[PDB]
Design a protein around this ligand. Sequence first.
Ligand SMILES: [Zn+2]
Lengths: 125, 132, 131, 129, 129, 128
Amino acid sequence: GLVPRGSHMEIKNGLCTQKYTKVYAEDKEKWKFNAPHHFIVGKADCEDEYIEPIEYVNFQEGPIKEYGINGVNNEDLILMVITRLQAFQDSPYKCRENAMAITKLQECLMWLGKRTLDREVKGIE
Amino acid sequence: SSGLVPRGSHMEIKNGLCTQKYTKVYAEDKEKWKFNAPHHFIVGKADCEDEYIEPIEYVNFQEGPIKEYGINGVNNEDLILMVITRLQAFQDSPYKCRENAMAITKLQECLMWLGKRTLDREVKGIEGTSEI
Amino acid sequence: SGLVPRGSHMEIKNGLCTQKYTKVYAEDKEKWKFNAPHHFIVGKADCEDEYIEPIEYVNFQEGPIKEYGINGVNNEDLILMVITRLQAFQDSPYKCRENAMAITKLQECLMWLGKRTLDREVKGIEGTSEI
Amino acid sequence: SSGLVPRGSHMEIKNGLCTQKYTKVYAEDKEKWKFNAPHHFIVGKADCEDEYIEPIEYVNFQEGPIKEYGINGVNNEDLILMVITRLQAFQDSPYKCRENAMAITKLQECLMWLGKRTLDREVKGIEGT
Amino acid sequence: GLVPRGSHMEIKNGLCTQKYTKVYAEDKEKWKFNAPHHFIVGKADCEDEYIEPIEYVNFQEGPIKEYGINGVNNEDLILMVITRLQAFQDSPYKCRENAMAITKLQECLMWLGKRTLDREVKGIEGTSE
Amino acid sequence: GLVPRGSHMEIKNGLCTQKYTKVYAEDKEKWKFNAPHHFIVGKADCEDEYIEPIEYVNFQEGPIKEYGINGVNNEDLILMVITRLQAFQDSPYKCRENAMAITKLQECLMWLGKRTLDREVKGIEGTS
Ligand SMILES: [Zn+2]
């Protein structure tokens, strides 16, 4: 149950621990409209040759009236993480770090939403 | 028809900060939550009738502590990494803007706080376990 | 004359605010209605404490709008003014980093207040007196 | 007496972060901006036609050096202080909530940054020049 | 040379890289004014029994009025760090992380000051009050 | 107990109350590796001519693998301030302001640590 890596590009961050999982995106050659759109979360034990897919995440690619609805938005994933962290706060695992994180995520959503509202005033959205 | 599954015990995720214009986010109902949180999420098209959900994407989080149960789903940090990567690509484009910069900053701080939790919980040797 | 009696007006003192030339007064807590002060006066500082030299009057919306109508400004309007002026300052020879940080903080203040408002829109209780 | 006055050269402050559901904010014409900023704001009612403004309140800021023109207006700090006092009153009430707490923190930090600049000018001795 | 650890405790925090230096203070029982006031930074060669000093950092204990200047403030060290990071930003190693740190440290200073300014609204100074 | 100020420069910030102490450092012309490394905290009693020193603070100057361990790192000082501020919070002096300051200092640590980790992913440490 593996699949070849190929030119799938591994997303390494300084803030990755990459202890359990690794994140990949499509080859930078295939980025449409300035950004990657097709991510894979796989298991880290894997050799660089292959990826052990745990999950596939595909973002909205292309204009909506033209290619339909074919993926998720950033806001959706952030909302998922916020929901889970709020659940964790309602448990014995409540802690100040999760609270800080939730605040940071809500402020993130605020700033992206500010981008859309500003365009709306000009009608561009 | 072939793209519809019933809402059933799935709950819509309401948030006032999310536009909900083209998509809706669902999760499993609270009764079914294990390890205190939802783990099985669906993003689906908004203009659907309530009785059904039209799935676009399935996202399944790690259910259970890994040391005990192994690896069976994504982590919060993985999704946040995807979002940071996309926002930084946007910044490296003609559509660089200040709002995207702010969002990147907030997301990186979010990762740093979650990471402080993980660091502290490494030092205690209780990382990936179910202990408080 | 230009002076009015202080009377039951109360001085708003805050360490973070300089207070060299202006003073902020509000109606007394006793006469506060709707859980907050609503009738503020900026006056000149070097005036008799017994009196107030009014520079400006600012009256806020008293009571939810859907129940009492419209009778004053909201917090959001004042903050919008301050943001507009600081941005004008940024688009001038006096552009600086402190003004940029202040604009950011005020915009985040608006976004937090706005999240409250949107959550009450979802709950259908916006502009009411419900919790 | 219709409680209603012509817009004219007044300009409308449209911002993405403001809904304009109940009130609209106007300022004086950009051509009449003195010393790089607007100084004469109006809060009016939104349902009015663009032709006119239904004034609720007028807010004026210090325009010009005090030595020469006097104290003619308010400071940004004054309005921020009013808003903080009001939100802290709300927190001491059944309407206590976390968003208000955030707002207070943000507004206090805003005051801190504005105060920073002055303190800096003071240390360098170039204040109010 | 070397001094033994004895009644000195290592300040471990997960946010600190710990890679070449260690930080020590008086052991908890000796704290005065509810706080550690005598810190030593030292080498990480692990003679668990002993500490290899690099710097002694001593904080003001007590009311200045009662005891006089006898140590350093938190403000002073934070000033040193801000000054170095601003120097770094005026260098080939300018970076966004350093800019963030300078902002966080300036806001730290701003909050501590509020505490004092608010105390000065009541006039209480350098006191147990 | 005095020392001449001489080349030393006073570091003055508005955000400093600084009513009782002043902080001095070496001359900019003697700054090495782009930044100051030698600092003194002194009483403000004195005139410009002299410094009365309460404390000496010397930071690690030169790469650690050439010159050994000859000074402190910013992380150490920030650590100490955090540790004392948490101490005050377990005391009658607990205030919101302090908590907020501890939050800011911890976020400072997170950002500086983000630099090292990034450099580490890129494989570089303490390079020129
Ligand atoms: Zn912040």
